[PDB]
Amino acid sequence: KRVLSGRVAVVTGSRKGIGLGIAMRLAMAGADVVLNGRRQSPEDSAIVEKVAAYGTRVRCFAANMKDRAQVEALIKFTEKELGAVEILVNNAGIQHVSPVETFPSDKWDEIIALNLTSAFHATQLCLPSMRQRGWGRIINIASVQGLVGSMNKSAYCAAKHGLIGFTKVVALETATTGITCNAICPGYVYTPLVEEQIKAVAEAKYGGDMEAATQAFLCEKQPAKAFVTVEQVGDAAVFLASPGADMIRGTTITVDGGWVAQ
Amino acid sequence: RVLSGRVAVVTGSRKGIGLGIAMRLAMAGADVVLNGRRQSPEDSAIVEKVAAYGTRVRCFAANMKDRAQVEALIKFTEKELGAVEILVNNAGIQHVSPVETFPSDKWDEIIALNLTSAFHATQLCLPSMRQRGWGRIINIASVQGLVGSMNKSAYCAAKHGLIGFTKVVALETATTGITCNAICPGYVYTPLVEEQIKAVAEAKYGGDMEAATQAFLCEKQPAKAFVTVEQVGDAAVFLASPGADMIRGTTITVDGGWVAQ
Amino acid sequence: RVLSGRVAVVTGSRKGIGLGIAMRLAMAGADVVLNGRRQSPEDSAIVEKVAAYGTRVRCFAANMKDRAQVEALIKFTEKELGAVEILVNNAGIQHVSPVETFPSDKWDEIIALNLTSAFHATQLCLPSMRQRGWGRIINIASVQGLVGSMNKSAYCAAKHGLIGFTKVVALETATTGITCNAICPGYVYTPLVEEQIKAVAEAKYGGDMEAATQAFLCEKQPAKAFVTVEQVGDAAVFLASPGADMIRGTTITVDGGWVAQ
Amino acid sequence: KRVLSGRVAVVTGSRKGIGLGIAMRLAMAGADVVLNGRRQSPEDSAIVEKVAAYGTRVRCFAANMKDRAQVEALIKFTEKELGAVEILVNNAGIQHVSPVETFPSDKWDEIIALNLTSAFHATQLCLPSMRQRGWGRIINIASVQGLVGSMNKSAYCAAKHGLIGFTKVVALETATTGITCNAICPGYVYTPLAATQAFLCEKQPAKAFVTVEQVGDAAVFLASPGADMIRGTTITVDGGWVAQ
């Protein structure tokens, strides 16, 4: 009765924020989902129950995406529990803000590895099964930062641009198959990552005024002056994984409220 | 059915992409107004095929170049069905020719139909959409609006301009419940592309349609397959959904990897 | 000099970006023909300035909307100086208005001047360039051809279309000695932009030109400074230089970072 | 006096091919140039003289750009011999053609490290001097693969896209200064690495190679005063590759 009934879905970094939203919207669309985190938490059961509220089979796994062996462990766990990985959502993404002059080298390395190389490892490990089964959906969670630049986000922008490029190459390498690769490029999304930013901006320039600080934060970059929701990102992912997008290959779905239209 | 009760208008939708977009909009539950240049004896059958999905579907004859007829269509839809909420500008005409010998008349026609008619329709529909607080404007551009192709100067220019207009409209309605976006299809199975492929087959491959079709596809589309009209309609339904509130001034490209290279 | 002996035609070069481009092309050794809609008493002075660089200079009054006058300009250049070897399509106008109340005549004029005139000039100039085996067709687009801006729907659509046309022309001539590239300036310190700034200062900042300029630049250009006409001319000279033989169908964006965000 | 007379430039990965062309065209413009290579070779002397043929001070340094310490050694050597680094051309890069399924992990890491992260290291080490002096040029030699995708070049395309994004961010971070950051995106260039016509005809509509000299010309344009307001953009020299 649902578009994605019987599809096995694996979302990296899906125990919080955008990844959790994508997992929720995929399970709502009828897909079994494997949530991924770094290490187990007492609330793992609560999150798993929240996603399972949609009637699909839901699993949880704690794999550090930086280690390729753990990525392979995640894929094999999904294959054993639910069957071949059919939808792969490369969402693992961290942020660090600093001018290029003072950007720590280890932080740059971590951002590049987690946002770019982890997607490479997961795609490499999942492609053979998708080719064997004649169907697949590689969805990379990029940002508007993958299309345009922003100050003090050199590592993030470079990683997301590279993720879009890798999306293009993977789409081209599978163009004559039942496997598509595409990227989602959200704008600002309300999350702890952004709530801490809003609180810091209130400390800096707005003196603890939440409403004005948030309004200015959005007015800077998003013309809509509104936050993109995790549900909207997940709905874009569901559209990408839907049959209607069988010929959507190597492109971007931009959910930004106008950020890259200027 | 994410579009129950929505009133939608599709321009140039008696055949090809517009027809499929109308069908897909009907499946979502939206009343749909088709359109073509002139009335046809085929109106009954086509409208019935679209109506098979249990939505109020009408047919109107208007010339999108003439703004008076666009106003007539908009008032027709406002009174027959209701206030226009989903506007689809599907432009059809195409003339292939090198720049040196491209007729001025056909260049003007291509720019006026692919670009100016969308501007007129958007200008006329925006007041009602701002009043109602909701609106979805979808411009059916092409991949030619993102990149260039030989002997398609007018078409590429018009589609690029359509994308630019999409961006400006989206920015001018950013804080409303009105979004404007564009869909960019590649080679799509339709009678017009079939005419192009027949020309190619007669010119280069001794009239063999299969060989000419493969040559046509492999030139630009890595997928080596046609984008179908149903996929364009699905993209239009995705954009027009209320869940696309924060999708503004962007392109949804359905081209089988064309623009990725 | 770099372009010594080349015959160049810059459209709309009686002031602003066009005059700067003419000056910088002549500084590179190129003969230049300036163009205006109406003959002006200042013509001679302008000529003198360009002629300060020692090349041959001419002036011609012809609105690019009329293709007949465009052909008159081309044949005038051929008579006086020789074959048109560089073609700078720069004639541009602006009309800031919301889409809802955008006048139809202004939209039509903007599309015609900013897009169709380039088409006519390129069409008339291409055959000679093909015969000679060398040519440069430099279209002066804007950042508005790459992104959208509120109340600039017509202008953005026209510049996007100009970029598409540049791509198609560059592709149709890829194997020849003719290149087609577009320049995308941001806010450029010219009389026109000063008029726009004065308008916004009177309407919004109580006549304070400093405040209006600060708001104008900070809204769009990260450099918080103007692009000079000399810089656009330098980009044009670079595109017309021999080093740019393999620069085809691309954009040289001079905007202080407008599109980088 | 020439347009770039008095400028001190460092071109990384410039022992051959694109980097050597860029260096020689910068020298033609009057700039002083420090070439860089992974390791010393006899050719070093020869190459140093070739650039030096244009009457500018030229030096050579052997330093693996994947190592930050060696990058800082290169920069400090240039400061020692010629002076502060005013022009920085991030050009070191390599290619490895393979499908994503069988792409060796170490090769992916090396391509990312040399095409993207070495640019970050060089820029980070050079920016303070350019800010204090108030003038700087950072030219990152990207590729058409930084703009579009190509089969069996996932690592390369990813690295070049990231390099372009880094260019945009740097340009934005230096917008109100005399420092511009821009990226050149060449197509197929005539380098050591009937078949020729088939090879070109697929990607370059011009059906002709791009020269290293043309890449150098684009770099000279970016480093000239006419480019003071060109920031965070791409100069694409590809014979029409990206126009389709």
Side-chain angles (χ1 to χ4, degrees), chain A residues 2-262, chain B, chain C, chain D residues 2-244:
Chain A
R2 297 195 281 187
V3 51
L4 295 175
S5 290
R7 294 294 183 185
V8 189
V10 166
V11 189
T12 55
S14 64
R15 229 163 74 202
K16 293 179 179 179
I18 305 89
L20 176 52
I22 294 164
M24 299 226 66
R25 303 305 290 188
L26 290 170
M28 157 182 303
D32 301 2
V33 192
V34 181
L35 322 180
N36 186 94
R38 280 189 309 156
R39 283 191 293 269
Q40 302 155 22
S41 181
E43 67 184 352
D44 278 2
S45 52
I47 276 59
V48 173
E49 188 174 358
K50 223 309 190 184
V51 175
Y54 290 122
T56 57
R57 290 184 303 168
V58 182
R59 300 293 193 273
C60 183
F61 202 74
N64 177 7
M65 298 313 302
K66 280 162 279 195
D67 181 325
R68 188 181 183 273
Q70 302 198 25
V71 181
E72 187 169 353
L74 171 69
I75 303 310
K76 274 167 158 46
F77 168 83
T78 299
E79 290 176 356
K80 301 279 146 291
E81 281 287 345
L82 317 175
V85 176
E86 318 189 45
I87 304 172
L88 175 69
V89 180
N90 295 311
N91 171 68
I94 59 168
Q95 178 60 279
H96 181 71
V97 173
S98 167
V100 168
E101 287 85 346
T102 70
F103 208 113
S105 62
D106 57 332
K107 231 71 184 180
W108 170 284
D109 288 350
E110 187 184 13
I111 287 176
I112 298 288
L114 201 52
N115 282 282
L116 198 58
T117 302
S118 299
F120 159 60
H121 286 327
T123 305
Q124 182 181 73
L125 290 169
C126 286
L127 271 167
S129 176
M130 295 168 180
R131 287 192 181 262
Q132 253 181 335
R133 300 174 73 89
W135 195 94
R137 287 292 192 273
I138 307 298
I139 306 171
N140 296 321
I141 306 307
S143 173
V144 296
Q145 311 295 359
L147 296 171
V148 297
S150 294
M151 279 185 295
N152 303 291
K153 296 184 172 181
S154 59
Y156 196 79
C157 285
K160 298 303 192 180
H161 278 69
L163 182 52
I164 289 176
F166 178 84
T167 297
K168 293 169 177 183
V169 179
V170 168
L172 293 171
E173 288 188 6
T174 62
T176 71
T177 80
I179 309 176
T180 73
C181 193
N182 300 273
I184 301 169
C185 302
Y188 284 151
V189 179
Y190 201 106
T191 57
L193 178 155
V194 179
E195 191 161 5
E196 182 177 350
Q197 292 265 271
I198 291 170
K199 293 178 178 178
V201 172
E203 289 184 21
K205 257 189 175 62
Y206 295 92
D209 187 350
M210 72 305 279
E211 201 177 329
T214 294
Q215 289 174 347
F217 188 84
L218 289 184
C219 186
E220 194 208 4
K221 296 287 185 180
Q222 281 190 167
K225 296 178 177 174
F227 277 107
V228 175
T229 74
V230 297
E231 294 81 33
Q232 290 162 336
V233 178
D235 279 3
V238 167
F239 169 75
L240 280 177
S242 65
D246 278 358
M247 283 298 145
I248 297 181
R249 301 180 182 278
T251 192
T252 55
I253 308 306
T254 301
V255 188
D256 62 349
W259 183 324
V260 186
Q262 46 158 238
Chain B
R1 301 183 88 98
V2 305
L3 303 182
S4 289
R6 294 298 184 188
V7 199
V9 182
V10 194
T11 65
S13 50
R14 187 177 62 84
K15 43 181 286 176
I17 279 57
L19 180 57
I21 292 171
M23 294 201 292
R24 285 286 165 176
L25 286 174
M27 313 213 323
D31 300 333
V32 169
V33 169
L34 279 77
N35 178 240
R37 311 168 308 184
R38 53 176 81 115
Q39 288 193 32
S40 64
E42 299 176 355
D43 284 354
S44 54
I46 297 166
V47 176
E48 182 174 351
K49 309 326 175 61
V50 179
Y53 305 93
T55 40
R56 300 147 72 208
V57 305
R58 302 286 163 268
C59 197
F60 196 96
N63 201 11
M64 298 311 304
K65 315 207 310 181
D66 179 3
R67 162 155 176 158
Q69 308 190 30
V70 179
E71 148 61 3
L73 208 184
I74 292 178
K75 294 300 95 159
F76 163 95
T77 309
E78 190 154 13
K79 270 38 174 167
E80 285 248 0
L81 271 51
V84 190
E85 299 174 319
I86 299 170
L87 172 57
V88 178
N89 304 293
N90 173 224
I93 59 162
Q94 166 66 287
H95 187 91
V96 178
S97 168
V99 168
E100 292 85 339
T101 65
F102 202 106
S104 177
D105 293 336
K106 272 309 210 175
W107 172 283
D108 298 352
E109 187 91 4
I110 290 167
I111 302 287
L113 184 154
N114 291 16
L115 190 59
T116 314
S117 51
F119 152 73
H120 282 321
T122 295
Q123 176 169 64
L124 291 168
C125 285
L126 277 172
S128 186
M129 296 176 175
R130 302 188 97 97
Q131 293 177 335
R132 297 294 181 192
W134 198 89
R136 295 291 184 271
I137 302 176
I138 308 176
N139 312 345
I140 307 309
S142 184
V143 301
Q144 309 296 4
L146 300 178
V147 290
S149 289
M150 292 176 90
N151 304 313
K152 297 185 166 186
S153 61
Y155 190 69
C156 288
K159 295 304 191 181
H160 277 77
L162 183 57
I163 285 176
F165 176 77
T166 299
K167 296 177 190 167
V168 169
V169 172
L171 293 180
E172 289 185 11
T173 42
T175 57
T176 62
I178 310 180
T179 73
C180 183
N181 304 275
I183 299 173
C184 295
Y187 287 159
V188 56
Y189 196 57
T190 206
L192 174 47
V193 75
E194 186 175 343
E195 291 185 354
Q196 287 187 58
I197 297 180
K198 183 175 183 178
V200 170
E202 288 183 347
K204 294 167 64 183
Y205 306 104
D208 189 320
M209 282 297 249
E210 296 166 328
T213 302
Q214 191 71 358
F216 197 78
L217 260 44
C218 296
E219 182 186 35
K220 298 289 190 176
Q221 287 211 358
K224 301 181 183 180
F226 279 94
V227 176
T228 74
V229 292
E230 292 83 16
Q231 315 185 327
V232 182
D234 281 327
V237 169
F238 169 71
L239 288 174
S241 171
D245 170 26
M246 291 297 296
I247 300 181
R248 302 175 181 270
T250 194
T251 67
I252 303 300
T253 300
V254 197
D255 62 355
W258 181 324
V259 174
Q261 54 184 24
Chain C
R1 282 166 282 179
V2 195
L3 303 173
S4 200
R6 299 301 186 184
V7 179
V9 177
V10 190
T11 64
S13 59
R14 181 177 65 83
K15 63 192 216 162
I17 281 156
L19 173 54
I21 294 168
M23 298 250 302
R24 284 277 165 168
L25 288 167
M27 188 191 313
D31 294 355
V32 179
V33 181
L34 318 169
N35 172 260
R37 198 217 281 121
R38 190 201 96 268
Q39 200 163 51
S40 178
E42 306 93 45
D43 295 334
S44 49
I46 308 307
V47 165
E48 188 179 357
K49 278 186 66 167
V50 180
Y53 297 99
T55 65
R56 299 187 296 168
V57 176
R58 301 292 183 274
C59 182
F60 198 79
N63 75 321
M64 315 308 288
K65 280 164 59 63
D66 179 354
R67 66 184 182 277
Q69 304 192 40
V70 174
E71 193 165 0
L73 159 65
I74 296 299
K75 300 331 184 203
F76 168 80
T77 301
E78 276 171 357
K79 188 205 315 189
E80 296 293 331
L81 303 184
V84 177
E85 291 170 296
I86 304 178
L87 173 61
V88 176
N89 296 314
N90 172 55
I93 54 160
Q94 177 66 273
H95 181 271
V96 179
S97 161
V99 178
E100 290 77 356
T101 62
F102 206 96
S104 174
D105 50 316
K106 292 301 244 189
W107 171 282
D108 295 315
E109 189 184 24
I110 282 173
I111 296 295
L113 197 90
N114 296 276
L115 175 54
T116 293
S117 295
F119 161 65
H120 284 151
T122 298
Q123 181 175 81
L124 291 182
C125 285
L126 271 171
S128 174
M129 294 167 180
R130 284 192 180 274
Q131 311 220 35
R132 301 288 288 278
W134 194 94
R136 293 286 191 272
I137 305 185
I138 310 179
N139 306 297
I140 306 307
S142 175
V143 298
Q144 308 294 358
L146 299 176
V147 296
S149 289
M150 269 178 290
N151 305 329
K152 282 165 175 177
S153 40
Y155 193 83
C156 291
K159 297 304 184 184
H160 275 81
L162 192 58
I163 295 183
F165 181 84
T166 300
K167 291 170 179 174
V168 175
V169 174
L171 287 174
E172 291 182 14
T173 59
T175 64
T176 74
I178 306 171
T179 70
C180 196
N181 299 277
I183 303 175
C184 298
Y187 287 141
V188 189
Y189 179 65
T190 70
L192 172 55
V193 191
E194 282 297 319
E195 291 188 329
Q196 297 170 232
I197 291 178
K198 185 164 133 184
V200 289
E202 290 184 332
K204 215 195 205 205
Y205 301 94
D208 190 328
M209 283 288 290
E210 258 278 304
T213 296
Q214 212 200 36
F216 202 79
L217 291 179
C218 290
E219 188 193 5
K220 298 299 191 178
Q221 294 207 167
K224 303 171 184 284
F226 282 107
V227 181
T228 70
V229 299
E230 289 73 9
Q231 291 161 335
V232 180
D234 284 323
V237 170
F238 168 72
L239 276 173
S241 64
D245 291 334
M246 290 299 282
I247 299 181
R248 298 183 184 276
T250 181
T251 55
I252 306 297
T253 300
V254 191
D255 67 351
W258 187 328
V259 181
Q261 53 181 14
Chain D
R2 284 170 274 164
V3 49
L4 292 184
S5 296
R7 302 300 185 187
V8 177
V10 172
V11 188
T12 68
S14 50
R15 55 156 279 104
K16 61 182 180 180
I18 293 84
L20 179 57
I22 297 166
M24 234 175 300
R25 304 301 275 195
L26 290 176
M28 286 177 65
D32 297 312
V33 177
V34 184
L35 296 197
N36 167 262
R38 301 184 179 192
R39 296 179 183 281
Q40 293 188 5
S41 63
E43 303 157 52
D44 285 10
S45 279
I47 301 166
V48 173
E49 297 181 3
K50 195 182 199 77
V51 179
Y54 296 106
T56 52
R57 298 179 309 172
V58 183
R59 297 295 186 285
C60 180
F61 204 81
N64 193 285
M65 295 303 294
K66 313 168 69 181
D67 178 359
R68 171 174 176 101
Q70 296 182 17
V71 176
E72 192 172 7
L74 159 67
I75 293 166
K76 294 286 169 277
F77 166 83
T78 300
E79 295 169 8
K80 251 164 42 176
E81 293 286 309
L82 276 38
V85 186
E86 324 191 51
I87 304 173
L88 168 56
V89 189
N90 290 319
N91 170 75
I94 42 173
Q95 179 63 272
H96 183 87
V97 185
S98 177
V100 176
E101 285 83 332
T102 66
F103 210 101
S105 184
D106 67 337
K107 290 280 170 280
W108 172 281
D109 284 353
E110 177 169 356
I111 290 185
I112 300 280
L114 197 66
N115 293 255
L116 184 57
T117 311
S118 51
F120 166 76
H121 292 321
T123 293
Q124 180 172 86
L125 296 179
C126 283
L127 271 171
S129 178
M130 300 184 175
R131 284 199 190 275
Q132 192 217 332
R133 304 282 188 286
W135 190 95
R137 285 290 189 280
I138 305 178
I139 310 179
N140 304 324
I141 307 303
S143 177
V144 296
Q145 316 299 24
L147 301 176
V148 297
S150 288
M151 260 162 31
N152 308 295
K153 300 182 181 174
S154 45
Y156 193 90
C157 295
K160 294 307 187 186
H161 278 59
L163 189 65
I164 294 179
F166 176 68
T167 305
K168 294 173 184 173
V169 164
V170 172
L172 293 174
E173 291 191 25
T174 58
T176 65
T177 76
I179 313 164
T180 66
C181 190
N182 298 269
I184 300 173
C185 296
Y188 283 134
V189 182
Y190 189 99
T191 63
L193 63 148
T196 68
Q197 197 73 327
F199 178 91
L200 282 181
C201 184
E202 168 162 350
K203 297 296 188 179
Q204 287 193 165
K207 299 172 172 136
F209 279 104
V210 182
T211 55
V212 301
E213 282 80 355
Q214 288 160 333
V215 184
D217 288 335
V220 165
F221 171 73
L222 285 176
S224 287
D228 287 336
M229 288 300 289
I230 303 181
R231 306 177 175 274
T233 185
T234 46
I235 304 292
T236 305
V237 194
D238 64 354
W241 184 325
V242 173
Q244 50 178 21

